Design a binder for these strands. Structure first.
Lengths: 852, 136, 86, 80
RNA sequence: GUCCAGCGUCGCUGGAC
């Protein structure tokens, strides 16, 4: 069994403790060496993914220092720190004699004088002086005739079988003599990496196969084979005749030479590092196995000081509690994706992450702030390398939106890249995905406006850019145009600056309106282009918008949802994204009644935004220039004041996650496309007042636009949200309310029944939907005058829908007389009485409703 | 039928009924048996939660227990899968050959049905008349 | 400086022989990766300190500034009447 | 400024050096060893207390000779 | 409502009573 104590007495880095992680592999390799020693003994240990290869090798070296066959081991020799012109033969020779010299000097303690002591020492000096003379034929460049006499010179002793100098044999006798003196069975040599100095490998590879081929020698080299393969291939071209290369280059001999060189290197690698001897370091995922499988040996982790080993929890469960709590995630499959990815990291790095989390958490008696601090100190290199923000302080809404958009740009995934998932081909990017996801859950925790800012600025900008802006200049055609277009976009939307949420909404209206539909009709993704000037001939009750027609609170809604853009002629727009900007600005008040009047008055105004530069009417728009209740708003200010009392009490306890905000937008964005597309053609000539699902007008388009936002909040919050440990939608098909309200009320009814069964209130299970449904700003949009169907088949659904909404909020929004007018001079204070009669630009009111 | 629906957004939303989706749902459902809610998340995994854009290179009745039986059968099916599939030994050639036949078969079907729609193909009995149900 | 010392490690006869676009990419990444392991090992990231430009210290338009900088345009100017750098 | 603040747990600040205003072939290790020599010799001579600068000086002088012997590895174009 | 003018390639927009 394996136990790791995070609360080690000295609190060391990486919490090595005991047994490390590869005790099984270490004992396996050491047993393998003893078998071989009892020609080629080259063991290759692959240290990659920034592993602690040196730590593992030193464990082997230390282990062999207490051995039954006591094969002594030299000291590690890094080839990148030796002198450049010093051959790699010398460090082993110096290491051998230094190790040997200590022992014979230590023989004095055992024996002050002995026969072997006097003979062994002088015998050893003879071998070394023998090697020095023959050492001359290593770096010499020209064979002088003097060395011929030495080669023919014969020594009656030392038993040199092969004639000549033969430096290979001279080293062999020296090694054989050393082993007998030290009373060992083999001498072991370890070679470290060559990454810092690329070329140091060649003078090692040609030294293993020349001087280290012996029965009483074993070597253990590390590194990666990508450099070694490039090193061998480079040296195999230098022996081709230089002249031949420029002569026979007829595009056929190039293939022949290339095919042959790849052949020589292949036989070279298999000669030095055999396949059977290569060893590989297991990772944490392969050692604990997949969840639900026993796999290899299990691991237990301690979490508190003075914690009994009988209660130590599994390592997979130890990480699982950190991610789910830190990232505000449920126990679903997605959380298992983060832990599986996090398990593949090196052990030495992972234990640093766990120690920095559990120690601080125990000392705290804001979990996401604790998790993010742990990751910063461990994956700081990957954060810097990717180019994201890396300052220790200055964290806020300003930088997070910039980081998200500068991450998807490098990931080249504008479709679903804002979920911040660890699927990427770069280790730097996979390390940044977890850090970014943690930062999101910390920032927008316990607040409503920060959540709405993440939904718009963080995720809306990415999706808006992909559909509209990207089409202008694709990235694959060219790179200067694509990179130029990005920098113009981020400056235009003012990401990072984020002056206000409503500021973003106006710009998003300008970008969307830039690319029009082929039918030339004034309906877009999430807006409808209301007319500004009265047209010539209106067949029915159609007329100008005339915002002054509204009453006290309807005017507050319209003024909050009205924004204009100047491109060639002043265009007027009514966008649902403006309403989200209004709620985001108000909700961040945290002030008394006095500031509410100021803040509420600032929300309602007239704002004109200029066209983005990448359009064909930027110069004309700038040239043409951008130019041309307080008593009654007390009720409106009174309502929002009561709502803000609820918001402050409720929002403290909501736990948004990086996935919940991502999922909400995907449903919301898709629903906006359907309603724009499926109401575009049903304008007709006598379609005012609605009362039929076939005929639609301006009011119906906006009601289903705001409703789609609320519907997406409901569904994606039940399935994905931390404050609950289950879901209440039930086992059923989930669709969207694109043309009728029955789909939206159907899930309200189902949820309502289940909640009463468990005696749970909406304020504990669906805090977000309760907060948004009880919003005084958008209540008039739910039931406009012209956007309510009155068919006998569907009016019961709407009547049931009205009762449910009242029960959720707690008060009767609409009076009985007010409802009766809607389904059939009355003045409505909480209902838009004029929008259905407005006209839509580009809409020609021809033909009529379909027959039958 | 829900598992065989896909929407593509290019100047107009389009609806297809792809056989490829069924293979996806079968591949998605049989991933795990850890949770019961997994086999109902696969039906509505993509139906109304995402949109796909045209590729760049283009030239231009309680209503709450409705799935109480379908989930029940699928749940019982996963019991058989978890036991039979242990003794499965696929090869790099077996997968190659099944796709060659499957791909060739589909291409023939899509050609001998483009001209067999006519006007009275509904209730298609004769082999010379085909509708959207025979094709699928 | 470092990337230049890396390309001097490849055997010249190899650089001039395998001039394929597919091979150039393979050797391009092995160097842009080798230099980063050199720098991230020699100057650790947690120790680097970046100096501050004028815009960071002064601030953007009406934004509050981290520090206060004033300049004098005349030997006869008084230290109590020095105007802001912006 | 950083050096001045440190100069006025004890850390002795070496004089600032720049490789550009130096002899072309002079190794960095030679320059740093030269600046270390000045401080310790100045400290020893100014110390002038008891006979500590008779035992310490010999040890310091011994290490310089060892460094001078092995300096040839830095400036060798070939192995000897 | 009607008249004058301006922007885009009929639609949009300003102004007057």
């Amino acid at each position: 069994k394996i136990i790791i104590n995070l609360f080690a007495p000295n609190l060391p880095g990486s919490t090595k403790e005991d047994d490390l992680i590869q005790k099984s592999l270490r004992d396996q390799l050491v047993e393998s060496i003893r078998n071989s020693i009892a020609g080629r003994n080259v063991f290759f240990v692959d240290g990659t993914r920034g592993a602690g290869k040196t730590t593992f090798i030193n464990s082997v070296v230390k282990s062999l220092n207490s051995d039954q066959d006591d094969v002594k081991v030299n000291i590690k020799c890094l080839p990148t720190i030796d002198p450049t012109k010093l051959p790699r033969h010398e460090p082993i020779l110096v290491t051998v004699t230094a190790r040997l010299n200590k022992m014979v000097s230590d023989k004095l303690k055992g024996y002050w004088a002995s026969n072997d002591y006097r003979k062994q020492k002088e015998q050893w000096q003879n071998h070394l002086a023998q090697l020095q003379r023959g050492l001359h034929l290593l770096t010499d460049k020209e064979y002088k005739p003097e060395y011929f006499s030495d080669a023919l010179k014969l020594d009656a002793q030392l038993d040199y079988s092969i004639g000549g100098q033969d430096l290979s044999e001279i080293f062999e006798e020296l090694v054989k003599r050393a082993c007998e003196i030290l009373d060992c069975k083999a001498i072991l040599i370890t070679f470290d990496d060559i990454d810092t100095q690329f070329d140091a490998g060649w003078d090692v590879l040609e030294s293993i196969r020349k001087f280290f081929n012996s029965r009483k020698l074993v070597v253990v080299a590390t590194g990666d084979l990508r450099l070694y393969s490039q090193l061998i291939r480079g040296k195999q071209y230098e022996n081709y005749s230089k002249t031949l290369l420029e002569q026979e280059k007829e595009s056929v001999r190039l293939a022949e030479r290339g095919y042959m060189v790849e052949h020589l290197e292949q036989q070279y690698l298999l000669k030095l590092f055999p396949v059977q001897k290569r060893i590989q370091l297991k990772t944490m995922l392969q050692l604990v196995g997949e969840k639900g499988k026993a796999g290899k040996e299990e691991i237990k982790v301690k979490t508190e000081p003075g914690m009994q080993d009988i209660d130590a929890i599994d390592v997979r469960q130890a990480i699982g509690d950190a991610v789910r709590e830190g990232l505000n995630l449920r126990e679903g499959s997605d959380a298992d994706m983060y832990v599986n990815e996090l398990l593949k990291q090196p052990v030495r790095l992972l234990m640093q992450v766990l120690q920095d989390f559990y120690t601080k958490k125990y000392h705290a008696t804001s979990v996401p702030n604790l998790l993010r601090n742990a990751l910063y100190g461990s994956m700081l290199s990957s954060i810097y390398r990717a180019g994201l923000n890396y300052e220790q302080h200055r964290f806020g809404m300003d930088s997070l939106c910039k980081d998200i958009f500068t991450y998807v740009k490098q990931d080249r995934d504008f479709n679903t890249g804002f979920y911040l998932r660890p699927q990427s081909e770069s280790e730097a990017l996979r390390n940044c995905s977890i850090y970014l996801a943690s930062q999101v859950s910390e920032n927008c925790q316990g607040s409503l406006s920060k959540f709405l800012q993440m939904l718009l600025v963080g995720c809306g900008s990415v999706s808006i850019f992909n559909q509209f802006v990207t089409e202008l200049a694709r990235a694959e055609n060219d790179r200067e145009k694509f990179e130029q277009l990005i920098s113009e976009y981020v400056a235009y939307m003012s990401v990072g600056r984020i002056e206000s949420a409503s500021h973003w909404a106006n710009r998003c209206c300008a970008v969307v309106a830039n690319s029009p539909n082929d039918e030339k009709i004034g309906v877009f993704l999430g807006m409808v282009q209301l007319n500004r000037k009265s047209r010539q001939h209106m067949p029915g009750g159609y007329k100008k918008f005339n915002i002054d027609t509204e009453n006290g609170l309807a005017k507050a809604a319209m003024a909050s949802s009205l924004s204009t853009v100047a491109s060639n002629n002043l265009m007027d727009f009514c966008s649902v994204f403006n309403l989200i900007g209004a709620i985001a600005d108000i909700s961040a008040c945290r002030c008394e009644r006095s500031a509410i009047t100021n803040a509420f008055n600032k929300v309602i105004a007239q704002t004109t935004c200029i066209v983005p530069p990448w359009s064909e009417a930027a110069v004309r728009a700038e040239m043409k220039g951008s130019s041309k209740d307080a008593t009654e708003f007390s009720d409106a200010i009174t309502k929002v004041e009561q709502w803000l009392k609820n918001v402050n009490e409720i929002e403290i306890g909501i736990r948004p996650s990086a996935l919940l905000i991502g999922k909400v937008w995907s449903r919301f964005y898709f629903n906006l496309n359907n309603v724009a597309d499926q109401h575009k053609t049903r304008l007709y000539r006598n379609a005012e007042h609605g009362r039929m699902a076939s005929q639609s007008n301006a009011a119906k388009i906006m009601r289903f636009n705001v409703l789609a936002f609320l519907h997406a909040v409901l569904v994606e919050e039940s399935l994905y949200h931390s404050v609950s440990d289950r879901e209440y939608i039930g086992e059923g098909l989930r669709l969207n309310p694109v043309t009728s309200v029955d789909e939206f009320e159907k899930k309200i009814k189902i949820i309502g029944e289940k909640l009463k069964a468990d005696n749970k209130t909406w304020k504990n299970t669906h805090p977000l939907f309760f907060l948004l449904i009880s919003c005084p700003i958008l209540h008039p949009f739910i039931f406009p005058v012209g956007g309510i169907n009155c068919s006998v088949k569907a009016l019961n659904k709407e009547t049931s829908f009205n009762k449910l909404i009242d029960e959720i909020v707690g008060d009767k929004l609409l009076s009985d007389e007010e409802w009766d007018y809607l389904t059939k001079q009355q003045i409505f204070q909480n209902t838009i009485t004029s929008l259905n009669s407005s006209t839509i630009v580009g809409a020609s009111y021809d033909k009529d409703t379909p027959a039958r | 039928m829900a598992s065989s629906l896909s929407t593509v957004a290019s100047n107009n939303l389009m609806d297809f009924c792809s056989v490829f989706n069924l293979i996806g749902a079968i591949a998605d459902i049989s991933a795990c048996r850890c949770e019961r809610s997994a086999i109902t998340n696969a039906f509505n995994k993509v139906i109304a939660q995402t949109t796909c854009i045209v590729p760049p290179w283009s030239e231009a009745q309680d209503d709450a227990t409705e799935f109480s039986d379908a989930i029940t059968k699928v749940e019982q099916w996963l019991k058989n899968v978890n036991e039979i599939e242990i003794g499965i030994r696929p090869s790099a050639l077996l997968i190659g050959k099944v796709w060659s036949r499957f791909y060739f078969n589909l291409n023939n079907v899509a050609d001998q049905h483009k001209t067999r729609l006519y006007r009275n193909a509904e209730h298609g009995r004769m082999a010379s008349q085909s509708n959207a149900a025979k094709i699928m």
